[PDB]
Design an enzyme around this catalytic site. Structure first.
Site, short mmCIF file in Angstrom:
data_model
loop_
_atom_site.label_atom_id
_atom_site.label_comp_id
_atom_site.label_asym_id
_atom_site.label_seq_id
_atom_site.Cartn_x
_atom_site.Cartn_y
_atom_site.Cartn_z
N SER A 33 0.60 -1.20 0.19
CA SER A 33 0.38 0.00 0.04
C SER A 33 0.60 1.15 -0.24
O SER A 33 0.07 2.54 0.42
CB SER A 33 -0.81 -0.24 1.66
OG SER A 33 -1.83 -0.39 0.56
N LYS A 36 -0.03 3.66 -2.76
CA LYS A 36 -1.17 4.66 -2.38
C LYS A 36 -1.03 5.95 -2.65
O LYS A 36 -0.99 7.19 -3.09
CB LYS A 36 -2.11 4.01 -1.71
CG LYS A 36 -2.75 2.57 -1.88
CD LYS A 36 -3.99 2.50 -0.63
CE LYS A 36 -5.22 0.92 -1.23
NZ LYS A 36 -3.79 -0.02 -1.17
N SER A 90 -5.86 2.96 3.28
CA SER A 90 -5.38 1.60 3.23
C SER A 90 -6.62 1.59 1.87
O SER A 90 -6.24 -0.06 1.71
CB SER A 90 -4.38 1.07 3.51
OG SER A 90 -3.55 0.79 2.47
N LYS A 197 1.86 6.46 5.85
CA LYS A 197 1.29 5.59 4.99
C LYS A 197 1.94 4.29 5.70
O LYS A 197 3.33 4.28 5.87
CB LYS A 197 1.49 5.92 3.21
CG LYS A 197 0.47 4.19 2.51
CD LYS A 197 -0.65 4.65 2.33
CE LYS A 197 -1.55 3.63 2.25
NZ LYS A 197 -1.34 3.01 3.87
#
Length: 252
Positions: A33, A36, A90, A197
Site C-alpha cells: 500500500s 497509494k 489503505s 502510509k
C-alpha cells in the site's frame, strides 16, 4: 549505528536531504500500500476535480478479483473521499477506482505512475497497478525516500493521510462505513506527523513511511519488510530515540 528488526530502512533530514540512517536501502522489494502515495500524486497532478462523485470500479484491476472490501462496486463517493480512504485506511477499492476515472484511461494512469517515478529518479521502482496488491509494485527504501521528499509538494496528501478516523457516506445505494487510520501514532500526541502510509503483504512484509518531526528536525522515514505487526513501529521509535538523544537501543 543502531540495529533494526525490519529488512530495510532509510531516514533523511528534510532540511538538507542528508541520509541520517540507512539499512539495505537499495534492496528491491514489493511495497504494498505504500503504492497509494503515488496513486494519490498521479490524481492530483492531473488536477481532477476533488468534489466529483465517482463510481467504485475495479473492472481493470485483476489484482482485486476475489479481494474482500466493504466498499461496494458501483456505489458513489467523491474523488477527495477516495483519496482519503486510500491514504488514511489503505482501502484498495478506493485506490483502484481512482485510476478508473483518469484522462486517457486506466493504462494512462499506470504510465503516469511510472513516468513520475522516472522523473523523481526512482530508478529501482516499478508500478503495474494503483493499489499495491501486486507483487510487481516494487521499490527501495532509497526510492521511497525520494517519494516522501516529493510528497512535500502535495499538502492534501499529508492532511488526508494523517486523519485519525472518519465516517464515509456513499450513494447508490446510501450507506455509511466507519474508517480509521492504519497508523495508531496519529492518536499519540507525542508524535508530530505530517504524512503517513503503512503497508502489508506477506511478500512486502509490514511497511511504514512517514514525514515527521523529531525535536525540531523534519525527517523522512522509511521502514520496509518488518515481520510482526508492531515491529516497524518499534523500529521507528528506536530510531527516533537515537536521532533525538544519541542513545543506541538493542532490537528486542
Amino acid at each position: 549505528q543502531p540495529q533494526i528488526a525490519s529488512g530495510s530502512a532509510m531516514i533523511v533530514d528534510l532540511n538538507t536531504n542528508k541520509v541520517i540512517y540507512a539499512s539495505h536501502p537499495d534492496l528491491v522489494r514489493p511495497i504494498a500500500s505504500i503504492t497509494k502515495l503515488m496513486t494519490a500524486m498521479v490524481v492530483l497532478d492531473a488536477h481532477l476535480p476533488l468534489d466529483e462523485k465517482l463510481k467504485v470500479d475495479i473492472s481493470h484491476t485483476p489484482e482485486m478479483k476475489g479481494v474482500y472490501s466493504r466498499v461496494r462496486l458501483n456505489s458513489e463517493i467523491s474523488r477527495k473521499n477516495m483519496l482519503l480512504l486510500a491514504l488514511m485506511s489503505s482501502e484498495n477499492r478506493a485506490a483502484a477506482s481512482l485510476a478508473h476515472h483518469y484522462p486517457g484511461g486506466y493504462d494512462a494512469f499506470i504510465r503516469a505512475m511510472n513516468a513520475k517515478a522516472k522523473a523523481l529518479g526512482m530508478n529501482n521502482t516499478r508500478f503495474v497497478e494503483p493499489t499495491g496488491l501486486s507483487i510487481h509494485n516494487v521499490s527501495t527504501a532509497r526510492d521511497l525516500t525520494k517519494l516522501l521528499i516529493a510528497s512535500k509538494q502535495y499538502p492534501l496528501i499529508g492532511q488526508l493521510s494523517t486523519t485519525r478516523e472518519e465516517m464515509a457516506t456513499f450513494a447508490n445505494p446510501a450507506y455509511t462505513l466507519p474508517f480509521r487510520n492504519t497508523n495508531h501514532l496519529v492518536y499519540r500526541e507525542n508524535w508530530n506527523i505530517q504524512l503517513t502510509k503503512t503497508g502489508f503483504t506477506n511478500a512486502a512484509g509490514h511497511c511504514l513511511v512517514m514525514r515527521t518531526v523529531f525535536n525540531g528536525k523534519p525527517v523522512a522515514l522509511v521502514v520496509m519488510d518488518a515481520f510482526g505487526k508492531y515491529t516497524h513501529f518499534a523500529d521507528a521509535s528506536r530510531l527516533r530515540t537515537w536521532i533525538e538523544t544519541g542513545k543506541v537501543q538493542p532490537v528486542p
